[PDB]
Symmetry: C2
Subunit: 306 residues, 2 copies
Amino acid sequence: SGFRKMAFPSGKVEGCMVQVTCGTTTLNGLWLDDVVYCPRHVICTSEDMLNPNYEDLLIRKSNHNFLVQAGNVQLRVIGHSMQNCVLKLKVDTANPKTPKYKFVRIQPGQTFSVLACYNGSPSGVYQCAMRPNFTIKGSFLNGSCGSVGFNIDYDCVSFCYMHHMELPTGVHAGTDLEGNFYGPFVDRQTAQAAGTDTTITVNVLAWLYAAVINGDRWFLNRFTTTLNDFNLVAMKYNYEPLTQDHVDILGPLSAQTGIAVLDMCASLKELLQNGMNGRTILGSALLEDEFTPFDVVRQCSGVTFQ
Amino acid sequence: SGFRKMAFPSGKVEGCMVQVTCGTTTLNGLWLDDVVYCPRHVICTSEDMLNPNYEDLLIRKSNHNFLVQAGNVQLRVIGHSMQNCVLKLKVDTANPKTPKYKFVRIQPGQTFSVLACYNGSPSGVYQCAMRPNFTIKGSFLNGSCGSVGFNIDYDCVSFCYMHHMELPTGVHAGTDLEGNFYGPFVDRQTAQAAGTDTTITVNVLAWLYAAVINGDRWFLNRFTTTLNDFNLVAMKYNYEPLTQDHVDILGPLSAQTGIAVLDMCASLKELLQNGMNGRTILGSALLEDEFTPFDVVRQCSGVTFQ
């Protein structure tokens, strides 16, 4: 028992990290088969970032302008193309540690692990949620761009995030591995701000089911609610609306505990309107929204009585 | 910026995990050079657990009675001895992925990463503290015994913890890699209870320095305090006493931020007495004590590992 924010083991990802330098710019790349992926701003300078013309800048670059290092050994670059905001560097060597992998685009509220890297080398691993405003609350310093987020499903690594930039409130923005930004952000030095961040309700409900399972039920009530009513109250408290997909995903936790999703929604509606009277749930003073229902199910491993 | 509960990259440790089966008992082992380390209770059954005579049980086992599996490959066991509560299995093969490593015994309030494993397979990584009562607040299910805790410094993995058992309050007990329990606990089913757990004061101060470095400085007051003043307030809130050694250890963070230790202590004394008035620190409603001063420096410097 016990409940912890937990990341995926980072080893299959550590086997793909490389350093990529262009001119005086260095950041991290991801080496899969004979390709290296990195943020396209590696070809820029600080001065270019004010109004960058990526097509033109890449035109004036040869393969020889990209120095790719996998620890000690240099990788020869044979080709370079841009896909949206990611550079793809074709190399003469296939990564012998390439895991089974896929590129996925994740949805707001879905979690993933981040391997923070500097100069092609891992610094640390932590669990993140894609916020409703298409930011993540990371821990990243200069040199971290090209750090990736990922899930492991079976033995298959699903890469879902590449780090590009930090916004003025200290949250981070990036792309999927096809180089499309999450959210309304661009890889240019211009006034950007993250939108109003909302709370990931399906994750708050997952966490409430976790509370119940680890013994805390002080907040439960006999009342039940309908879904549109809940959503109208949710809206008022900067909570994301709960969709039918979300109700479906909470099915296993509902079944294990015998507490219907709409029952738990009624408990949450109450907690939002009244506050929590300085009482801790699973040792937290605030409702946690970065635990998915799948995260709670894995750690709790409960049975369902039918 | 950003500040996250961050684990060490787990890859060096994932290459050492194996499955150890003895009769019908299966749990995890650690394969370094030609030795496999695991909890000695692998040689027990549910029968033996009440009050097991480990010496007698081990005498009645040959090398042939131990099946060690490293993915698909079976390892030949060539020797076996017991050191305190760990079994050591000599195998015919040195682990070719053995990292630079050492065995250390940590002190209460020191942090480390746990690689949670099931049947020799890594499932999760998370950051933990050794509590003042020599328990850890883990996330472990049946099958997790022999999961290890570790730090990385330089290119060197320091193994500090092996998981043995869960106490009736849902907290976890185990051993260093020489098989000596942390705390007053034994590897038998006996009435055993964790002592009074306190907060790790020096770690809360480290965390306040992290907040400041990241721009969350609302809690800083102009008040200074004596060490004894601070302690006499702190004691009341189930906080460890702060020692001169603790003040010394916070020197680097004090120097980097240009804020005196005893100033920060005065800010903490204020937070303890008055609460946070709704404000959060680094997104958190509660004071966090699972970051050491070295943890804050590593994360804020972007320290990497081989």
